[PDB]
Design a protein around this ligand. Sequence first.
Ligand SMILES: O=C(Cc1ccc(O)cc1)Nc1ncc(-c2ccc(O)cc2)nc1Cc1ccccc1
Ligand SMILES: [Ca+2]
Ligand SMILES: [Ca+2]
Ligand SMILES: [Ca+2]
Length: 194
Amino acid sequence: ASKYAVKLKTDFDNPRWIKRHKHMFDFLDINGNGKITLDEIVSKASDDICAKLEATPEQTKRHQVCVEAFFRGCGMEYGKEIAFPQYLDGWKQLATSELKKWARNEPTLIREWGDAVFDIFDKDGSGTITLDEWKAYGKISGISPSQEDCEATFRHCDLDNSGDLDVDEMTRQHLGFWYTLDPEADGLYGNGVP
Ligand SMILES: O=C(Cc1ccc(O)cc1)Nc1ncc(-c2ccc(O)cc2)nc1Cc1ccccc1
Ligand SMILES: [Ca+2]
Ligand SMILES: [Ca+2]
Ligand SMILES: [Ca+2]
């Protein structure tokens, strides 16, 4: 099954990797000082997104704890200001480590994060995401506020064409965008992220 088939390794010191994370870095650098902190990342990637999605307090805590683990895996910490090259070093370590974990059947940070987001999207608790529950990632995060190709990204996430999404599909498309830079996932976050 495509949703469980992931590359064993990736390449990192290329223009697509660098530009993708640069656009995210600049967006998450709330105070614009050229350094990113875990405070800034959690504010944008967890506080604002869970508020927009009307997550419950338990869902929001869970989500935040997953975001913190994930970015601690990149070398982030509260109050620690990190410049873009060291941020990139961290993401290289994280992606390398996580792809090895996947191939060895060890739990990954990205899959746990997927679980937390999936639970929030699955408003009726059905165990799948239907098109009416789906959202444009670029729009809910604010980095591409004009993104409206929800149905196209939904269809591409739906690897088995069941007409709905499971958590493994959502996680596979997310990992495709951020670890392995799969061309099929390009555009997932709208025009604000190359
Ligand atoms: O995209 C999401 C939500 C999500 C969806 C599916 C899934 O399986 C897991 C998570 N979160 C996300 N996932 C990844 C990253 C992320 C990636 C790269 C990077 O350098 C920084 C943050 N950020 C974010 C939040 C965010 C903040 C700001 C603008 C857009 C999105
Ligand atoms: Ca900053
Ligand atoms: Ca549902
Ligand atoms: Ca499906």
